[PDB]
Design a protein around this ligand. Structure first.
Ligand SMILES: [Zn+2]
Lengths: 31, 20, 53, 157, 147, 277, 48, 310, 248, 190, 9, 43
């Protein structure tokens, strides 16, 4: 069990959509 | 040694402990 | 058919008890019914100020 | 004559003498399985205090046996040898003649296995290793909590 | 018993108040040693070893307190634990070889020195091992020690 | 037979508040609060009824049900239900033994005693000793104690520490001891007094200590003799010389000069080498 | 709001107060004190 | 063990029923599994590729005790304790129709894989029912005096093998509505009746924990037995445990009350397998019909195990 | 997720309907909340809902049933077993040390860490070798009834500590109704007060100044009831010798 | 004595067995290590040996720890891997996507269970009742206990969660117990 | 003594 | 394997102990039966 009293808030994570970069990898020579 | 320490605990006398 | 008669009755009773529509969960299910109002009246009058041990 | 086999355990060394003139077939079975490296890397799967140290299973379970006469062979009880003390090497079976590749060091006088298992040796050197083997914590099914792995067992000579 | 309870209460309150000071553990354990409560003193010292695992002074005092009450096997187990936990503190190794030379037991001192030489110590421990083997004759084994 | 006699009429039995020892009645704890603490425990009053076993016994709606506990209020003499009570209204016999979690009235027994040592009791001591005090100090204490501490059960030993007005009654049964403690508390012996029948502590007399230790030892010995086979235990004590000869001849198994260990000989199982069981 | 508040009230009434063990925030009245703590620890760490 | 068949795992679970799984089957192609359970639903699973549940049928008012794929593999057949049968379209997922007329719980049901299509519904009113799968009314019904718990239809399509509580396997003729011969040897109620893939032998497991293989060929001696198999105990539940034949006919598998599936050799008689893994009575043990060494077990711990034989 | 309950605490029915309550109560030894299992006993339609009274960890430490709290090898109470077998009682019984030990050892207690058998045989062998001017013989005046009809008490001397009061009570119950029986084992004295003088006269007639109860020799006389006070050890010894001398 | 035969010679001395081992030829009970009148009753550890043969002292550092715990306890751990005697090719590659995703699935299932527990604890669901009280059936085979050893019939036990009052507050207070001792600390490998 | 590697690799 | 008949047929070698259970009092396993079976046997 745990002892915290957070009410639910921001219950969905935002993900990097196409156009927002992030989860798209290139070679480090290109970088 | 555990038995000997038990025996020494069960027979301790606070008579000669007063002198250093 | 005389020897296989009580076995037939027991099998029919057991299968009707197990697979009947009236016992879908193992037991006969009824609807939550309304109690007489005097039951609640007596409970509330009896417990009172909640001063008795 | 008695021929020697050396158990290199993770407790010490056990040098066993083997009785060729009293129970031969078990003795060259033991010699051939020891010299081939078959008993190199198995476990001492069962230890019962004041009864037994039993091992030799390739699987370490209680069912493995790879005797050189196929998969099993027959019993060779000679009434001159009886289980009579601590440290006697005998070949263990399950009921009638089912001798595989499991050996059985008696840790105490057990005069009730006579005629059921094939006495075919003796601990010659290193009885303290077997005494420390008997005094191991075993959990529920006589298998020790730690491992008493055998490494080498050689004819020496 | 009232005096024992009040002293135990005072010592435990000092331990709860500041557990990172070795003097409280030392005083409580020495006092419980004085009424011959060896299990209690051992428990206090082991709790201090739980608070201070790598303190060499606490290890030395607990081995000494075990030795001065003629508990030899307990103290030898304690020295094994101490040289297991801190193999690079030469003080514990030196005490361990000194104790098992004081009690006779020359092969035991030799195997302790063999463990120490397995840990590859400084030149002082090698010279001490050579002096050990030179004292009781035994020159050829000192030659392998020089090798 | 005979139905259970109603002891007190329901007109005299109510459920009212305790006498006012304060200004505000606390309804969560059901206790008076306020006033002064000089009152506190005040005194132990005189109870509203005693018991006659020959007069108040009978049958209830509990003789039909096996395992029913005895009645606390029939033991207190203030049970009005009579034959309609759900608990037994008779005296505990010698075969009325209970497990070490409940008393004879079904109340749960505790880990340790309370400091004001009364109540249900603790299961960490098989206590059959009841401590009675507050007896009017006369010269005929022993006769009246033996007369009145006798209708509750079967008694082992009553030591009357006279002059102090204190007696220690040890019944042979723990349920009888609990019945006597719940029956004689706040009763009168011959004059108008309130008896302080509480749970006895331990008699420091070393003779009583060795008596209790021995009795514990033959109780455990009785349990072990019930557990073990008769031939096994008969070889175990070996007071019988024929049993000794049977042990010498049987524990050989072919090999002479063995004298088989008790772990091997006195062993029970399907694969043991013995007559087994 | 009031049912959460009364649940918290009954929780303190029937299982006690968890007074010790929670992390207090650094409010304004604590800022300087907190700074001192952190700075001392940092200095102490560098010394070791 | 190395990989033997074309499965994602050597053995794997199928779960999702909230009641006891009473009957599980296979596609004639061998790629689809249909299971009916105590929870009045039918779950349709895909064996190969990703093992995906792809269908649920919900039309029955009580437990579904049987379900049988048609000769092609697009129609499903449900016998259910609501005193009904049902034909289901497995393309739209809807129910085609319901078959009404049985006055008690239907325990068994079989369709003809060769010839005209019929339905064989044995039920506790002592009635076998021969149904056409286009009309909601029964073509015929043969009335007996004892509840019937296992039926099977022959290769010829004119013989009905019926087992019930009278401890006899009765062989009836459809056009005559009469038993052509009775087959004795059991002493507890027959739970399954399966004809061999070649049609030369008959398997019958009963509640005495003995599975009997029988010679079924028309020119046979007076005793039409073959062999008896032990080692599949029936536990506390008096379920209708149903066995199956392997495609080559060499092996037979019967679920046990210990959570095990006991597999024997039909010709030799050795206990080839005793497969654990269930926490209840294994109601069905089936072989893959498409020449694969695959066994599916359905058990009253609400689960099915798909395993390969190595 | 399953209790450790003995067979005699379980119902006689082989099919048990059992309720389970997570953290339903605190253990009666370590005072920690634990899962309580409860069932209805064979005493149908009234009685007590039998339940697991202690937790499973304390049931491993004590080797006891969770309901009855008795030893699961001999059927003895835990303290009786521990006193009569001299066992270690593996765990502290203090307040905070109980939760400390349970918090720090709950994984090794489950595996049987932290078998009496031989100590029971040791106890049986120890109880095998258990080791627990004279006055003239009584003349006729000792058992003849006195002329005073108010004399009612019967004085017994020679009582050992092994003789309970109930053996004397049902040994003298066959002669008549006993109003009172005072047995002081500290002073080896006993007083029997009847309700009718005929019963006391019959006791004196068929006892004749001597008695043997459970192998213990006792001496009986007529006596006016007097109290027993703080009394000298030498006088106790000499009337013990007199009670032994009741059988010369 | 040698072994073409050993009849007529009884072991009378503790050294008659050589180092030890009772002779099967003699049909007399033989005690190679004397009377086991008392038990071992020793609290020492089982002394093991290593591959080359020395007393193994890693049972002291590993005392109180599981077998999967990594404990450095010898000077061999202070040597570089490349220079560490029996060390040829060393594989220094990351795990492939299969093992990486398998570990990701396992760890995220465990952390998802922890998130569910933390969310249950963080905000309770107002009323904590569940009327979907499905029974659990247990096959319980009793052993022998309390004296008697008769084989009792095995039992089928229905275990149902008890109906709890939705209005009941938490029953017991929270106790502040001090921290237990840490895991046994490793050797100090300076 | 714990052996080292003399391969100069 | 190890579920075949010849694997279950082979016994455990060696002698028997002259001197397991899931819980402290016996062996208890989770089982799955119909509600009607338990009700009928209990009845
Ligand atoms: Zn119990």
């Amino acid at each position: 069990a745990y002892h915290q009293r957070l009410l639910p808030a921001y219950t969905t994570l935002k993900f990097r959509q196409p156009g927002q970069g992030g989860a798209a990898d290139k070679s480090t020579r290109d970088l | 040694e555990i038995a000997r320490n038990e025996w020494q605990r069960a027979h301790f006398d606070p008579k000669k402990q007063q002198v250093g | 058919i005389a020897k296989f008669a009580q076995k037939k009755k027991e099998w029919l009773r057991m299968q009707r008890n197990r697979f009947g529509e009236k016992r879908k969960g193992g037991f006969v299910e009824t609807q939550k019914a309304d109690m007489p109002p005097e039951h609640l009246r007596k409970i509330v009058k009896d417990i009172g100020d909640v001063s008795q041990k | 004559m008695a021929t020697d086999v050396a158990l290199e355990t993770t407790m010490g060394t056990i040098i066993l003498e083997l009785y060729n003139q009293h129970a031969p077939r078990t003795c060259e079975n033991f010699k051939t399985l020891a010299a081939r490296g078959y008993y190199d890397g198995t476990i001492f799967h069962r230890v019962i205090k004041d009864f037994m140290v039993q091992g030799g299973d390739p699987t370490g379970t209680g069912r493995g046996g790879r005797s050189i006469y196929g998969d099993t062979f027959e019993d060779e009880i000679h009434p001159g040898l009886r289980h009579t003390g601590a440290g006697i090497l005998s070949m263990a079976n399950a009921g009638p003649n089912t001798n595989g590749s499991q050996f059985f060091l008696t840790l105490a006088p057990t005069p009730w296995l006579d005629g059921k298992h094939t006495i075919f040796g003796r601990v010659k050197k290193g009885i303290r290793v077997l005494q420390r083997m008997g005094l191991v914590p075993t959990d529920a099914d006589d298998r020790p909590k730690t491992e008493i792995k055998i490494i080498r067992a050689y004819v020496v000579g | 018993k009232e005096y024992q309870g009040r002293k135990r209460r005072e010592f435990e309150d000092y331990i709860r108040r500041n557990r990172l000071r070795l003097q409280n553990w030392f005083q409580y354990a020495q006092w419980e040693l004085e009424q011959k409560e060896f299990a209690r003193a051992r428990s206090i010292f082991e709790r201090a070893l739980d608070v201070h695992p790598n303190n060499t002074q606490l290890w030395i005092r607990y081995i000494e307190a075990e030795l001065k009450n003629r508990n030899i096997n307990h103290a030898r187990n304690l020295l094994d634990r101490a040289v297991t936990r801190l193999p690079r503190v030469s003080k514990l190794w030196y005490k361990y070889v000194y104790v098992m030379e004081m009690l006779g037991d020359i092969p035991g001192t030799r195997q302790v020195f063999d463990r120490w030489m397995k840990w590859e110590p400084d030149e002082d421990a090698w010279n001490a091992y050579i002096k050990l083997e030179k004292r009781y004759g035994e020159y050829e084994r000192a030659r392998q020690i020089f090798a | 037979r005979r139905p259970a006699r109603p002891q007190i009429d329901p007109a005299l039995v109510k459920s009212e508040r305790p006498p006012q020892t304060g200004t505000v009645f606390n309804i969560w704890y059901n206790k008076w609060s306020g006033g002064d603490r000089e009152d506190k425990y005040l005194s132990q009053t005189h109870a509203k009824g005693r018991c006659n076993i020959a007069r108040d016994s009978g049958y209830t709606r509990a003789d039909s049900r096996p395992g029913s506990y005895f009645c606390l209020y029939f033991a207190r003499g203030i049970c009005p239900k009579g034959q309609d009570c759900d608990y037994l209204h008779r005296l505990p016999t010698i075969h009325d033994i209970f497990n070490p979690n409940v008393d004879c009235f079904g109340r749960d027994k505790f880990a340790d005693y309370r400091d004001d040592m009364g109540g249900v009791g603790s299961f960490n001591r098989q206590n059959r000793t009841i401590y009675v005090g507050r007896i009017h100090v006369t010269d005929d204490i022993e006769e009246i104690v033996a007369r009145h501490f006798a209708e509750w059960g079967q008694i082992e030993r009553i030591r009357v520490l006279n002059n102090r007005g204190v007696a220690f009654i040890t019944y042979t049964n723990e349920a009888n001891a609990q019945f006597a403690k719940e029956a004689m508390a706040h009763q009168s012996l011959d004059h108008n007094e309130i008896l302080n029948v509480r749970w006895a502590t331990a008699d420091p007399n070393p003779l009583a200590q060795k008596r209790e230790q021995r009795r514990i030892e033959e109780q455990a010995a009785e349990a072990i003799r019930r557990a073990l086979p008769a031939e096994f235990v008969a070889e175990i004590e070996g007071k019988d010389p024929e049993a000794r000869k049977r042990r010498k001849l049987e524990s050989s198994y072919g090999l002479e000069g063995y004298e088989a260990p008790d772990a091997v000989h006195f062993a029970r199982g399907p694969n043991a080498v013995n007559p087994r069981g | 709001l009031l049912e959460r508040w009364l649940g918290n009230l009954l929780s303190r009434q029937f299982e006690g107060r968890h007074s010790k063990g929670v992390a207090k925030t650094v409010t304004k009245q604590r800022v300087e004190s907190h700074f001192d703590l952190e700075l001392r620890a940092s200095v102490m760490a560098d010394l070791m | 063990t190395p990989r033997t068949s074309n499965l994602k795992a050597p053995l794997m679970e199928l779960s999702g029923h909230t009641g006891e799984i009473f009957t599980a089957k296979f596609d004639p192609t061998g790629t689809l599994i249909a299971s009916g359970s105590m929870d009045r639903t039918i779950m349709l699973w895909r064996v190969y590729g990703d093992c995906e549940n792809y269908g649920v049928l919900n039309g029955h008012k009580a437990a579904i005790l049987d379900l049988q794929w048609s000769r092609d593999g697009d129609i499903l057949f449900s016998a259910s304790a609501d005193m009904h049968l049902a034909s289901w379209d497995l393309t739209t997922g809807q129910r085609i129709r319901r078959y009404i007329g049985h006055e008690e719980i239907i325990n068994a049901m079989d369709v003809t894989q060769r010839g005209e299509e019929l339905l064989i519904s044995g039920s506790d009113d002592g009635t076998i029912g021969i149904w056409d799968p286009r009309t909601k009314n029964a073509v015929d019904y043969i009335e007996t005096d004892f509840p019937i718990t296992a039926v099977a239809v022959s290769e010829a399509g004119n013989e009905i093998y019926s087992g019930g509580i009278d401890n006899d396997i009765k062989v009836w003729d459809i056009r005559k509505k009469a038993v052509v011969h009775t087959m004795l040897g059991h002493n507890d109620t027959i739970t399954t009746l399966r004809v061999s893939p070649d049609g030369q032998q008959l398997l019958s497991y009963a509640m005495d924990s003995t599975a009997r293989t029988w010679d079924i060929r028309p020119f046979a001696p007076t005793d039409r037995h073959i062999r008896t198999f032990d080692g599949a105990p029936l536990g506390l539940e008096k379920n209708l445990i149903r066995g199956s034949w392997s495609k080559d006919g060499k092996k037979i598998a019967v679920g046990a009350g210990d959570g095990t599936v006991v597999i024997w050799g039909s010709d030799t008689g050795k206990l080839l397998y005793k497969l654990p893994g269930h926490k209840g009575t294994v109601n069905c043990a089936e072989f893959a019909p498409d020449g694969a060494p695959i066994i599916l077990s359905a058990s009253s711990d609400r689960t099915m195990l798909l395993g390969e034989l190595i | 997720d399953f209790p450790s309950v003995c067979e005699n605490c379980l119902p006689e029915n082989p099919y048990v309907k059992m309720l389970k309550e997570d953290y339903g109560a605190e253990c009666k030894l370590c005072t920690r909340p634990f899962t309580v299992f409860s069932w209805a006993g064979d005493g149908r339609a009234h009685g007590r809902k039998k339940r697991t009274n202690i937790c499973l960890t304390c049931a491993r430490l004590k080797n006891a049933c969770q309901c009855c709290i008795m030893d699961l090898q001999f059927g003895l109470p835990i303290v009786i077993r521990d006193k009569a077998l001299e066992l270690i009682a593996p765990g502290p019984q203090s307040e905070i040390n109980r939760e400390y030990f349970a918090q720090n050892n709950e994984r090794a207690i489950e595996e049987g860490r932290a078998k009496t058998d031989e100590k029971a045989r040791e106890l049986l062998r120890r109880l095998a070798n258990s080791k627990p001017a004279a006055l003239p013989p009584p003349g006729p005046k000792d058992w003849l009834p006195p002329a005073d009809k108010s004399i009612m008490s019967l004085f017994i001397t020679g009582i050992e500590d092994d003789l309970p009061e109930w053996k004397i009570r049902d040994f003298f119950k066959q002669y008549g109704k006993i109003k009172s029986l005072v047995v002081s084992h500290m002073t080896h004295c006993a007083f029997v007060n009847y309700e009718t003088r005929e019963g006391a006269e019959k006791a004196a007639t068929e006892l004749k100044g001597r008695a043997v109860i459970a192998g213990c020799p006792l001496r009986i006389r007529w006596s006016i009831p007097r109290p027993i006070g703080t009394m000298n050890k030498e006088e106790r010894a000499e009337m013990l010798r007199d009670g032994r001398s009741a059988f010369p | 004595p040698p072994y073409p035969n050993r009849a007529g010679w009884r072991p009378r001395a503790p050294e008659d067995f050589g180092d030890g081992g009772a002779f099967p030829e003699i049909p007399v009970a033989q005690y190679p290590w004397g009377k086991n009148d008392s038990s071992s009753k020793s609290n020492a550890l089982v002394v093991q040996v290593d591959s080359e043969g020395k007393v193994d002292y890693t049972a002291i550092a590993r005392q109180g720890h599981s077998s999967d715990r990594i404990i450095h306890a010898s000077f061999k751990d202070l040597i570089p891997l490349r220079q560490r005697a029996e060390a040829g090719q060393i594989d220094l590659s990351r795990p492939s996507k299969e093992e990486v995703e398998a570990t990701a699935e396992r760890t995220k299932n465990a952390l998802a269970a922890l998130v569910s527990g933390a969310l249950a604890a963080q905000k309770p669901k107002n009323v904590q009742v569940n009327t979907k009280r499905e029974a659990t059936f247990v096959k319980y085979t009793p052993s022998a206990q309390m004296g008697n050893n008769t084989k009792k019939q095995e039992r089928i036990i229905k275990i149902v969660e008890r109906q709890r009052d939705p209005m009941e507050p938490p029953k017991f207070k929270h106790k502040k117990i001090p921290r237990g001792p840490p895991s046994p600390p490793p050797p100090v490998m300076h | 003594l714990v052996r080292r590697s003399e391969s100069l690799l | 394997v190890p579920y075949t008949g010849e694997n279950l047929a082979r016994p455990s070698y060696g002698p028997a102990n002259p001197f397991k259970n899931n819980v402290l009092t016996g062996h208890a396993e989770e089982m799955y039966i119909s509600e009607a079976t338990f009700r009928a046997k209990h009845r």
